[PDB]
Amino acid sequence: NTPRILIVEDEPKLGQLLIDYLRAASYAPTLISHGDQVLPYVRQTPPDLILLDLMLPGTDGLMLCREIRRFSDIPIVMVTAKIEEIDRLLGLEIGADDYICKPYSPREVVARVKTILRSPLIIDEGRFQASWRGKMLDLTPAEFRLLKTLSHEPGKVFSREQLLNHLYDDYRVVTDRTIDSHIKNLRRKLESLDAEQSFIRAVYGVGYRWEADACRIV
Amino acid sequence: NTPRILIVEDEPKLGQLLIDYLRAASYAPTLISHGDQVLPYVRQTPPDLILLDLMLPGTDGLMLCREIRRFSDIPIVMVTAKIEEIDRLLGLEIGADDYICKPYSPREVVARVKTILPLIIDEGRFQASWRGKMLDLTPAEFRLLKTLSHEPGKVFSREQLLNHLYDDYRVVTDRTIDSHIKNLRRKLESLDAEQSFIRAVYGVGYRWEADACRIV
Numbered sequence: 001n002t003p004r005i006l007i008v009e010d011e012p013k014l015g016q017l018l019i020d021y022l023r024a025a026s027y028a029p030t031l032i033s034h035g036d037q038v039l040p041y042v043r044q045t046p047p048d049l050i051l052l053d054l055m056l057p058g059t060d061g062l063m064l065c066r067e068i069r070r071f072s073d074i075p076i077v078m079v080t081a082k083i084e085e086i087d088r089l090l091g092l093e094i095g096a097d098d099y100i101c102k103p104y105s106p107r108e109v110v111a112r113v114k115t116i117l118r119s120p121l122i123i124d125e126g127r128f129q130a131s132w133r134g135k136m137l138d139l140t141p142a143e144f145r146l147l148k149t150l151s152h153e154p155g156k157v158f159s160r161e162q163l164l165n166h167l168y169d170d171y172r173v174v175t176d177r178t179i180d181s182h183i184k185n186l187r188r189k190l191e192s193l194d195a196e197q198s199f200i201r202a203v204y205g206v207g208y209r210w211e212a213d214a215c216r217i218v
Numbered sequence: 219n220t221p222r223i224l225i226v227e228d229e230p231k232l233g234q235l236l237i238d239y240l241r242a243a244s245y246a247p248t249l250i251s252h253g254d255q256v257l258p259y260v261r262q263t264p265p266d267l268i269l270l271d272l273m274l275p276g277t278d279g280l281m282l283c284r285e286i287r288r289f290s291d292i293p294i295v296m297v298t299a300k301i302e303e304i305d306r307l308l309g310l311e312i313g314a315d316d317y318i319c320k321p322y323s324p325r326e327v328v329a330r331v332k333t334i335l336p337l338i339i340d341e342g343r344f345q346a347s348w349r350g351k352m353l354d355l356t357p358a359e360f361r362l363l364k365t366l367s368h369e370p371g372k373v374f375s376r377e378q379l380l381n382h383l384y385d386d387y388r389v390v391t392d393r394t395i396d397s398h399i400k401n402l403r404r405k406l407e408s409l410d411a412e413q414s415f416i417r418a419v420y421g422v423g424y425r426w427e428a429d430a431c432r433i434v
Contacts, residue, residue: 092280099295099296099330143392176396
C-alpha cells in the first residue's frame with residue numbers, strides 16, 4: 001500500500017532509470033509507451049501521480065496532458081527537457097561558499113514527487129499561542145506563561161512567589177510589572193471572549209487559582 | 219561601486235543573456251568563455267561572485283572550481299542550467315495539480331545570485347538605521363525612537379511616551395518606559411559611543427539629543 005506513479009516515457013533507458021529511482025524511494029512505478037494505452041489506464045487504474053514526458057516540440061505530450069486533465073485531478077509532472085544523472089556531483093564536498101544549483105537529475109524528479117505527495121482552551125507551546133473557544137488570544141509572553149501555568153493545574157492555588165518562579169524559568173519573559181498586573185490583564189483578555197466564565201480567582205496573600213477548564217496542550 | 223560578477227560560460231547566446239540580466243540587476247558582469255582564462259583572472263581581477271557553468275568543454279568545471287577554491291573563498295555558483303522554454307508552454311493554465319518539471323532559467327539564476335548578495339526611519343517596513351547600520355528594535359523601542367527623534371529638543375514625559383506606546387498596536391510588552399529607553403539607548407551606544415542620544419530626567423521626562431530623523 002504505497003503511492004503508485006505512472007511514468008509516461010518512450011525512451012526505454014530513461015524509463016527504466018526513473019523506475020529504479022522511484023521504486024527505491026518506496027513508490028510503485030509503472031511505465032507506459034505513450035500512445036492510446038495511457039487514457040484507459042488512468043480511468044481503470046488511477047495512479048497517485050503522473051510523470052509525463054512532453055516530447056517537446058512535439059505537442060503530442062501536451063495534447064495527452066490536456067486529455068487526462070479533462071476527467072481527473074491527478075497531479076501531473078510535466079517533464080520539459082531530458083532528465084540526466086550527474087554522478088560527477090556525488091561525493092563533492094560543499095563548503096560555506098559553495099552554492100550548487102540543483103541539477104536536472106532523476107534524484108530531483110524523485111524529490112519533487114515527494115513534495116507533491118504529502119476543552120475550550122487550547123494551548124500550543126510550539127508557537128506560543130492560546131485560544132478560548134477557538135478565538136485567538138493576543139498575549140504577552142508573561143501572560144502566556146501564567147495562562148499555561150494556571151490552566152494546566154486547575155483548582156490549584158499558585159502563590160505570587162510561585163508564579164514569579166515560573167516567569168523566571170521562562171526566558172523569553174522579561175517583566176517590570178507585578179504578578180497582580182498580569183493576572184488582571186490576562187483575565188481582562190479572557191473576559192473579552194466570554195464574560196460568562198470564571199477564569200482566574202485572586203485571594204490576597206493566598207494566591208491565584210484557575211477556575212475554568214483544563215487547557216488542552218497541542 | 220557595484221558587485222562584480224564573473225560568468226564562466228562557453229555558449230555565446232546564454233552567455234550574452236546572463237550578461238544582460240545581471241547588468242539589469244545593477245551588477246558588473248564579465249564573461250569568460252575558456253577555462254584557461256578564468257584562473258589568472260580570479261587572481262588579477264577578483265570578482266565578488268563566480269557564476270560557473272558545470273558543463274563546459276576542454277576542462278570540467280569541478281577541477282576548475284577546486285582550483286579557485288584553493289586560493290580564494292569567493293562564493294562560487296555551480297550552474298547546470300539552460301535556456302527557458304517560452305512559447306511551447308506560454309499561455310498554459312497551471313492548476314494546483316499541474317507541476318512543471320523544467321531546468322533552471324537564466325532568470326532564475328540571477329534571482330539566486332541576488333539572494334547570495336545619520337538616522338533614517340522607514341515607517342513602512344518599520345525599521346531604523348544609524349550611520350548606515352540597521353537597528354534591531356522591538357516595536358516599543360521603534361515607536362519611542364521615532365517619537366523622540368522626530369522632534370529633537372522637545373521633552374516628553376513618561377506619561378506621554380506611554381500614550382504613544384498605547385496608541386501603537388504593534389506594541390505588546392511586559393516592560394516599562396524606563397526599560398525601553400535604557401534599551402533603546404543601549405543599542406544606539408552599541409553602534410557609536412560618546413554620542414549622546416537620549417537624556418532621562420526623573421519627574422521631567424525624556425529628550426532626544428541628536429540630529430532629527432530622516433523619514434522613509
